[PDB]
């Protein structure tokens, strides 16, 4: 399988498909808990 290893900054979005609308979008440069 293809490796998708999120071990560095990334961009992400939460979307809905039928409307195509992006509900949330962001970038993570530091992991917090």
């Amino acid at each position: 399988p293809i490796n998708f290893h999120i071990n560095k900054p990334f961009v992400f979005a939460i979307r809905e498909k039928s409307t195509g609308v992006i509900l949330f979008i962001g970038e993570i440069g530091e992991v917090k808990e």
């Binding site: 399988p1 998708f4 949330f24 979008i25």
Partner: protein, 330 residues
């Protein structure tokens, strides 16, 4: 019918990233657009045109904007009963002030706005407003305001809430301690979740892209992972409707070995300071603003407060946003 794309989301992301210095950025363009669209129903002249420019709604009538928002909100609330979705709007205004019924009824009709006349000087009002925010975000955003200015006139507040469960969850027993290289180049140790499953996947010059579905697959998370030597700053700067459309259309079911950290972030923005002005909204934040649809009093927008929350773990994702448009009397 208006065919509104995600231009506002990309422009808001790019402009926010340009002005903030924090390592993380997390916004809800939907929450910001809904609160400002409620407000836009009261604006006239250049105040209205500058708001439409910032919202990427130039050329749309208020009727078409309202009907689009109304249909969009109802569709998001019913498309997946196995995902928790919240969309709430409220208007809070100074008791004793006269607010025009066509404005209030446009907001009740198309935004299902809860409308309340309040005494802004009461020690009970901040808990009432902040309590509403907590109620509409599963207590993830418990305050939108820390204070109410003496000249407060109206708050138009939107809350978006999301709690999805991955179609393919991670096993907690597969989560391991592993390094994550931060934006400044230093490394931290994180809880790295792992799974091997079928996911939507594609690539281009900069990045790898992954799509992770929730519930009945109506909602999903898109992850953009830059290749070695490439930056998220460049991804954000090059992200527009054309590029997003190319990513979505390129997605194919692929067997993927996924490694993803458990992560959480909470962000707060004052969008009136630099971001909405750069996007073209200037006059509404000044004493020359004109909101005759709301009242005969001279009012303007003093702050656009945007607060967000996101938590990602083995089970899914919980996310929330609140946007409060604060109007004051000049």
């Amino acid at each position: 019918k208006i065919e509104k794309d995600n231009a506002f989301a990309f422009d808001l992301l790019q402009t926010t990233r340009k002005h903030v210095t924090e390592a993380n950025v997390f916004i809800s363009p939907l929450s910001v657009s809904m609160a400002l669209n409620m407000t836009l129903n009261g604006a006239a002249g250049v105040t209205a045109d500058e708001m439409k420019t910032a919202l990427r709604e130039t050329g749309y009538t208020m009727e078409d904007i309202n009907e689009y928002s109304h249909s969009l909100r109802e569709a998001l609330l019913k498309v997946d009963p196995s995902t928790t979705i919240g969309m709430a709007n409220s208007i809070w205004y100074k008791q004793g002030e006269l607010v025009k019924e066509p404005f209030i009824l446009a907001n009740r009709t198309h935004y299902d706005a809860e409308v309340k006349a309040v005494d802004f000087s009461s020690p009970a009002t901040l808990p009432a407003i902040n309590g509403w925010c907590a109620q509409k975000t599963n207590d993830k955003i418990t305050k939108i305001l820390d204070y109410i200015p003496g000249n407060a006139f109206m708050y138009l507040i939107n809350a978006v809430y999301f709690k999805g469960i991955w179609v393919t969850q991670f096993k907690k027993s597969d989560t391991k301690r592993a390094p994550f290289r931060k934006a400044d180049g230093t490394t931290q140790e994180v809880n790295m979740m792992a799974q091997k499953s079928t996911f939507g996947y594609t690539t281009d010059e900069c990045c790898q892209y992954l799509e992770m579905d929730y519930g009945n697959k109506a909602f999903s998370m898109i992850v953009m992972l830059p290749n070695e030597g490439q930056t998220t700053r460049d991804v954000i700067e090059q992200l527009d409707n054309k590029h997003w459309s190319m990513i979505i259309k390129g997605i194919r079911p692929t067997q993927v070995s996924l490694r993803m950290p458990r992560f959480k972030t909470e962000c707060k923005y004052g969008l009136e300071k630099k971001i909405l002005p750069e996007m073209g909204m200037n006059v509404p934040f000044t004493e020359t603003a004109d909101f005759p649809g709301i009242t005969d009093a001279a009012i303007f927008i003093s702050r656009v407060i945007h607060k967000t929350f996101v938590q990602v773990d083995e089970e899914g994702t919980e996310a929330a946003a609140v946007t409060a448009v604060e109007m004051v009397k000049t």
